Design an enzyme around this catalytic site. Structure first.
Site, PDB file in Angstrom:
ATOM      1  N   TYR A  27       4.490  -4.200   2.525  1.00 48.52           N
ATOM      2  CA  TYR A  27       3.367  -3.493   3.139  1.00 48.52           C
ATOM      3  C   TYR A  27       2.166  -4.375   3.478  1.00 48.52           C
ATOM      4  CZ  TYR A  27       5.953   0.785   2.126  1.00 48.52           C
ATOM      5  OH  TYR A  27       6.971   1.718   2.159  1.00 48.52           O
ATOM      6  N   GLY A  29      -0.109  -7.190   5.222  1.00 51.01           N
ATOM      7  CA  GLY A  29      -0.159  -7.487   6.612  1.00 51.01           C
ATOM      8  C   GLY A  29       0.400  -6.154   7.040  1.00 51.01           C
ATOM      9  N   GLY A  31       3.064  -3.153   8.106  1.00 46.24           N
ATOM     10  CA  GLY A  31       4.489  -2.822   8.112  1.00 46.24           C
ATOM     11  C   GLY A  31       4.515  -1.425   7.504  1.00 46.24           C
ATOM     12  N   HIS A  47      -3.418   1.094   0.540  1.00 48.03           N
ATOM     13  CA  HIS A  47      -4.413   0.857   1.581  1.00 48.03           C
ATOM     14  C   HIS A  47      -3.921   1.457   2.894  1.00 48.03           C
ATOM     15  CE1 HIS A  47      -6.377  -1.399   4.856  1.00 48.03           C
ATOM     16  NE2 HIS A  47      -7.403  -1.553   4.042  1.00 48.03           N
ATOM     17  N   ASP A  48      -2.615   1.410   3.122  1.00 44.61           N
ATOM     18  CA  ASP A  48      -2.025   1.984   4.323  1.00 44.61           C
ATOM     19  C   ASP A  48      -2.110   3.519   4.285  1.00 44.61           C
ATOM     20  OD1 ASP A  48       0.036   1.679   6.756  1.00 44.61           O
ATOM     21  OD2 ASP A  48      -0.313  -0.316   5.892  1.00 44.61           O
ATOM     22  N   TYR A  51      -5.783   4.364   5.190  1.00 39.00           N
ATOM     23  CA  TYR A  51      -6.076   4.303   6.612  1.00 39.00           C
ATOM     24  C   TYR A  51      -5.452   5.503   7.317  1.00 39.00           C
ATOM     25  CZ  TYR A  51      -8.258  -0.330   7.238  1.00 39.00           C
ATOM     26  OH  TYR A  51      -9.083  -1.421   7.202  1.00 39.00           O
ATOM     27  N   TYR A  64     -18.300  -1.911  10.178  1.00 38.94           N
ATOM     28  CA  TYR A  64     -19.128  -1.206   9.204  1.00 38.94           C
ATOM     29  C   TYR A  64     -19.887  -2.280   8.451  1.00 38.94           C
ATOM     30  CZ  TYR A  64     -15.387  -2.556   5.874  1.00 38.94           C
ATOM     31  OH  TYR A  64     -14.466  -3.277   5.148  1.00 38.94           O
ATOM     32  N   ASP A  89     -11.058  -0.283   2.317  1.00 40.27           N
ATOM     33  CA  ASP A  89     -11.035  -1.738   2.254  1.00 40.27           C
ATOM     34  C   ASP A  89     -11.516  -2.271   0.910  1.00 40.27           C
ATOM     35  OD1 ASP A  89     -10.269  -1.450   4.884  1.00 40.27           O
ATOM     36  OD2 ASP A  89     -11.798  -2.759   5.721  1.00 40.27           O
TER      37      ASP A  89
HETATM   38  C1  LIG Z   1       0.639  -8.315   9.857  1.00 42.93           C
HETATM   39  C2  LIG Z   1      -0.908  -8.449   9.932  1.00 42.93           C
HETATM   40  C3  LIG Z   1      -2.105  -9.627  10.074  1.00 42.93           C
HETATM   41  C4  LIG Z   1      -3.535  -9.119  10.189  1.00 42.93           C
HETATM   42  C5  LIG Z   1      -3.710  -8.538   8.690  1.00 42.93           C
HETATM   43  C6  LIG Z   1      -4.893  -9.421   7.965  1.00 42.93           C
HETATM   44  C7  LIG Z   1      -5.105  -8.817   6.413  1.00 42.93           C
HETATM   45  C8  LIG Z   1      -3.659  -8.262   5.869  1.00 42.93           C
HETATM   46  C9  LIG Z   1      -3.780  -7.703   4.461  1.00 42.93           C
HETATM   47  C10 LIG Z   1      -4.179  -6.142   4.475  1.00 42.93           C
HETATM   48  C11 LIG Z   1      -3.075  -5.225   4.155  1.00 42.93           C
HETATM   49  C12 LIG Z   1      -2.861  -4.243   5.361  1.00 42.93           C
HETATM   50  C13 LIG Z   1      -2.852  -2.702   4.998  1.00 42.93           C
HETATM   51  O1  LIG Z   1      -2.990  -2.289   3.906  1.00 42.93           O
HETATM   52  O2  LIG Z   1      -1.731  -2.478   5.657  1.00 42.93           O
END
Ligand SMILES: CCCCCCCCCCCCC(=O)O
Ligand SMILES: CCCCCCCCCCCCC(=O)O
Lengths: 121, 121
Positions: A27, A29, A31, A47-48, A51, A64, A89
């Site tokens: 998850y 980055g 996905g 976190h996903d 959002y 923000y 965040d």
């Molecule tokens: C595949 C993404 C690259 C840009 C993401 C920069 C910070 C990634 C870490 C945050 C986790 C993302 C969320 O919770 O999905």
């Protein structure tokens, strides 16, 4: 926006959002499939889900403002969106720190392929 | 430099940088706009976000050296820039390989009007 989020992460963890979190586990980055690999990965997950509960907002782009009070992240008041995003965040970032001691290089650049199935948030 | 980056790409994916990854989706190339369309497109999005954290360098042309150790890409030692530029490239090429699975021809020469959101890094 990713600008605040990415900065948040370096202030809390000491690592650059890019390499260290852009493709960690299933998850991190972005996905969205599979069973979170570890603790750090569970936070990207949560976190996903965070959002995902802001249909009226643009999480990845709205800027923000936030400040650090006595070493703690404090989300300044803005719009309903900027505030809810900021809290999402902050929660993820803080979590990241809390689980730094389990951060495994073994999961950076993890094959998104190996993650199958959609967990009920 | 791109000459090294293109070499890793051909090695890890078997495809040539120019077609295969120069006009794919909304980010593999130079236009850079909208929201990544798939796994491969995101590797590209993350990659130039990576080039973004290197203001004091110039990724397009400074050449670095890398080699393989037990089949893995390893950035040889050098100037801070050469090393960071290489890490950006290393990860990107590996990312293209891990996603050769969903790489589809329907995203080549993708139209500008189909690249949507506002995204920054
Ligand atoms: C595949 C993404 C690259 C840009 C993401 C920069 C910070 C990634 C870490 C945050 C986790 C993302 C969320 O919770 O999905
Ligand atoms: C023959 C000369 C160089 C070929 C290298 C082309 C680089 C293609 C990579 C996609 C763009 C990456 C992202 O936007 O950084």
């Amino acid at each position: 926006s990713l600008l605040e989020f990415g900065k948040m992460i370096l202030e809390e963890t000491g690592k650059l959002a890019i390499p260290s979190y852009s493709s960690y586990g299933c998850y991190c980055g972005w996905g969205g499939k599979g069973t979170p690999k570890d603790a750090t990965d569970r936070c990207c997950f949560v976190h996903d889900c965070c959002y995902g509960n802001l249909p009226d907002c643009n999480p990845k782009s709205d800027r923000y403002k936030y400040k650090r009070v006595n070493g703690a992240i404090v989300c300044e008041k803005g719009t309903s969106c900027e505030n809810r995003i900021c809290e999402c965040d902050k929660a993820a970032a803080i979590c990241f720190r809390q689980n730094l001691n389990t951060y495994s290089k073994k999961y950076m650049l993890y094959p998104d392929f190996l993650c199958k199935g959609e967990l009920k948030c």
